[PDB]
Structures are given as structure tokens and as C-alpha cells.
Amino acid sequence: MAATAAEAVASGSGEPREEAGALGPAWDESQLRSYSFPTRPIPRLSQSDPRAEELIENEEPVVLTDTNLVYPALKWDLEYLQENIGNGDFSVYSASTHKFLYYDEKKMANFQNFKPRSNREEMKFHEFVEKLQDIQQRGGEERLYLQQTLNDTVGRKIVMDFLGFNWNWINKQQGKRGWGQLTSNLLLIGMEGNVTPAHYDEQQNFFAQIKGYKRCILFPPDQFECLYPYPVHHPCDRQSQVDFDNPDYERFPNFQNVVGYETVVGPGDVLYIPMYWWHHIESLLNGGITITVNFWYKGAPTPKRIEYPLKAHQKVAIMRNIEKMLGEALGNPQEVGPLLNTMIKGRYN
Amino acid sequence: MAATAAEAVASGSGEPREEAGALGPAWDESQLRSYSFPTRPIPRLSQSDPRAEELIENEEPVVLTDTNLVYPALKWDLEYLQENIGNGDFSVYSASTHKFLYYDEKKMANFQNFKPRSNREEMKFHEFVEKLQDIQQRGGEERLYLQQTLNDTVGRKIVMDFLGFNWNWINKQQGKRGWGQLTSNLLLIGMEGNVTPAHYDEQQNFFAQIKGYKRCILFPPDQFECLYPYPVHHPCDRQSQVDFDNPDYERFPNFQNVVGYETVVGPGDVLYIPMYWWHHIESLLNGGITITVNFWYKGAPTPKRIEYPLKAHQKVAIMRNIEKMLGEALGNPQEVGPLLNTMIKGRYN
């Protein structure tokens, strides 16, 4: 049966891999949250494996097992970082729940009636660490997620580690793909169970896992239809409106057709998250703190001669641009939806 | 009651006016087709009446009773025209029914499955006249409507008449409104009962009635919502998809909210049809042949400083432009609807 072949081709992230030295499973399926859609496994390859090069060239996700991209950072943990990350401020988001939905603060104006679900607080690294310990100590249910662009202020030893990244490998990758400049390295330190909801990014991303384990669910740009992004002017622009924990199939019917690419990344894995691909990211339940550094590159420039029919991501670019232009042209983001309905109701169904 | 005041403020085209010399009603209400919406009467004013100037300046419809715009043309009838209109070809549309739906022939390609409802045939004026007489003679049910831009070929006396138009009046009007150039004069000769379905034009129009009587139903550009124009790339671009004789309220629910401005124009009336205003035009039942000449002017140019919020017609311009750009950008008109639904389903409802 083709359903039969399909039911097992939804292997998720495969059987948990065994750590070297017979250290038993690093995780087990019970630490993954339960969702309603099938997924297939993102392949885990060697960086010298040509198939992995073929996937990156084609802008498909792959987990590279052996880049050494952030090899010096694998000794990172809270104690080390607090002694050497320096006295700069770090952006930390606080949430009552396990889904951190983010917001573009600038867009906070036009929509008055959005109410934030997680607040952001600036603090020195040592305060963040203490604030974690506190919550831990008092068995509290609060949740914190630190996300900060690594900046000049970082201490001596963190710079030394940084220089030890495998710039040769990723530099060549930037060249080979015609990508733009590296815009930033985002440091993410998460509490176990933390969820970043499905969203896509307007940059290419090499996602370098450092401590703990993150389950990554990806969807191709061609499943825009099933994922229902917030309006472009909305503070949650680029995130799915679908609550993966309780999907409203009445509002979002095509979410019943979504199929995900999935993987678990641990210390030393690099996950290529192609530009425009949706990703949902959860730090495994009872896995401890997680640490990731990503590398965000501006995407390749638009080609001289456009080849038709358009790829899916180009259509996302177009739709985004249509909403932006109507926003400016009407004098008000809030008339975009009304104009758009006038335009299709009874004309394009 | 405000419903009471409303039920009589839907006066339609008023009581039929009595012709000079006590010649009884020129028409009676029984010669108007029956429709489902209320209408109010377009005012009939003198060209020296400042209110009429106020309406034109504000781009609202008005019937000017005394322009003499086409005074020399009032002697026109079929016999005169056939003796002097010259031997050029005239475009004539043929229909099985009384609604002439037109088509942009160039757009006939992209949509294969549209089938024309009325065909066009080129013929010399004298053939058109004979073809009318024939249908008349044989009691046939066929319908013909001649519509031809008046061109160089017209005979000596038709040019003399043309020079006798009140260019002073309309020239000043063109100036006073900053309009563009006069692009054309369309001659329309209709069989009694002929209907031109609701549509809007991208030019300002002084509609100069010559022979017979035409009922004109207008709707403001702000009732775009209720009138459901064909997609821009569709051969019937700019016409309503609503069949006024049998409106499908399931497909076009807001047609139940449409309110029309209405009038009957007879020999010597000029109806200012403002750019973007919808108009539905019927030659009265058993009224005989009708003759109109219109004057189409390019509209005023876009203003240096845009004043917000936008007027309704500007929003029609915008929507039109959005559909055109997606058409080009996607490589195919036929993907415009699909992209547009992807964009709103579950995002702007």
C-alpha cells in the first residue's frame, strides 16, 4: 500500500542516535512534544558528502554533522559564558507559557489590540543566570529565553573562541552560494521545553547547536497556503497564526495538509535552514538548557534574467511586497485587508 | 418615517417631461425595464446653473439641458447619415439578446473558455441600414448596435455639422477641469430595447443624446464592492459580472446594497458621466432607434501632493494596478486569482 509506505516514511527524526562510548540514547522520543502533522526526517550528512552540497545548493535543509563550525564553543556553558561574555547587556524574553511568540516592537503601534504574550527585559549576563537559578530554586513556572546578537563587548576569551570557528568552511559556503554578507550571529540560550513557534526568516541560516538538544520542524516555502502568516504589518509578521498545540482548523483549514521536515540537533550539529523555509524550534523536554549560535547571511541577489514559472519563495517575496505597497499607498496598514477583500470577493472567489 | 422619505426619494427619472407644444409625454414609465434596486434621479439643470458647474467640478453626474453641444446633429437620422457619413467601414455588434456584453478582443487569448455573446461585423453604413430594415421587415428577433469612432472618412456635410458643435462650451469645460485631450467621439446607433450592461470607463464623458431616448443608470465608484467587475485580464474587464435581469445574490451578495443614479436623456440632452462611475444604458422599449455621440476626454493628471484618505476612484486605480502588476510579474494572468487567495485566506479573512 502507498499509505503503508507513507506511514513509515514519516519517520520523524529517526531512532535517537547513540552517543560515542556507549553512553546510551542522548534523548528518547518521549521528550518531543505531540503534534498533529506528519513529518519526514531531514538528512544528517557529512560536510564532505556531495549530497549535502547538493542540498545546500538547492536551498534544501540538511544537518551537517562534522563541520567543526563552532568547535571552540562546545565548551560553552553558563559558568564559562558568565566569566567571559563581558558586561554588555543581553536581551532576554520572559513568558508565562512555553511558546515564545515574538513581536516587532516598531509595529506595536498600528494594531492597538494586540497584547504581548512574552515581554523582553535587558539585563547583564550574570543577572540572567541568577534569574534562571532563582526560577529553578523556587520551582517556579516562569520561562526565560536569552537571544542576543554577539557584539563588540564580549570578553577576551569569547573572541578567541570566535576566531576558532571554521571560517574556511562557511566562508567557502558563502562564496559557493553567492550569498550576501554575514549580518549577525545570534546567541540563543533556552530553558528546556522552550518553543519558538513556526516562522520564516529573510536570510540564509547555518544553525550551530552548542549545548543541549533542539527539535527543529521545517516546512518548505510552498506550504505558505497551509501556515497562515500574520499580515505583514502585524507585529508577528512572518510567524504562523496557527497554534500548533491547538490548531483552529475552521480558521486555517489547509493546516490539515501540512507536511514537515524534522530533526534533532545536538552539540556540534549544523542545520542549514534555507531562507524562507518555515521553522519550529523546541528545546527538548527535561533536556536542560540549550545553547545555539546561528549565522545569518543575506540571500543571493535577484537574478538578471528571471526564469518562469516562479519558485515558491519568489511568490512569497511578491506577496510580501504587495502588502507593503498597499500599506504605504493607502496611508494606513489597516486598510490593506479591506482593500484586498474588495478586490477578490466575487472576482477571484 | 425615514423609510417613508426614502421610498419616494427613489424617484427614478421623475415623471416623464412633456414636450413643447403640448406634444404629450415623450415616454412613459412602461418603456423602462424592471430592476431590483432603488435609484435616485440625476438632476437636470441649465448649463448656466451654478449647481451644474458644482456637480461637474465634483465629478458628479448631471444632465445639461441646453448646451447646444451637438445642436447641428439633431437633424441626424438614418437617411441623412447614410447620404453623408461617407463610405468608411463601421463597427457593428450583433446579439441574440438585448444585453450587448462587449469584449476586449486582445484579451480573448488568456481565457479560452469565454464564449462571445455578441459578435462584431465591419460594414459600410448603407449595409447596416439595410440590415436593420431587413430585420425590421422580417420581424426577426436579431439585434444590432452600431458603435464607431467618427473618423476622417466622414462626408462633407458631417464635417460641417461637427464644426457647428459647441466647442466653446466643452473646450472651456476641458480647461476648467484640467482634463486631458479629447480622444474620440463615439457614434452609437441602437435598436429600441438595446442594453449596454453596467461598466465604467477610464475617461471623462459628455454623453450627447441625438435621437430617441436612453435610460442611464449610474453608480458611484464607491459601489465597486456591490458590482463585482470582471478580473482586469478578463475580456469583459470593467463590466459588472452581475446580470441585472437575474442577479445571483449568492455569488454577488453586496449587489443587494447597490443604489443607482438614474435619468432619461432625449434629443439635445448632455449627460456628464464622470470617469470611473458605473453606467448602465438602455434604449427605451419601443422607442425606435437611438442616436448618441459621446465625447471622451483623458482625465486630469495625478496631483503633485496626494491628499489622504484616498477617494474611491483612486482605490479603483490602485486595485486595477495591483492586478496588472501581478499579471506581468507572475508570467501569466491566470495565476493572479490563485496568488490573491493564498494572500488573504485566513490572513485578512
Binding site: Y103, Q147, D201, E202, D237, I318 | -
Partner: peptide, 15 residues
């Protein structure tokens, strides 16, 4: 020109 206008993309990331 039109096509390339609508194909240009911003570079918005995370928050």
C-alpha cells in the same frame, strides 16, 4: 522593471 520590483526582498530576522 516591474517584476524585479516585486521580487526584491527585505532581510528581516527573528525579532
Amino acid at each position: 522593471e516591474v517584476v524585479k520590483l516585486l521580487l526584491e526582498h527585505g532581510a528581516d530576522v527573528x525579532a
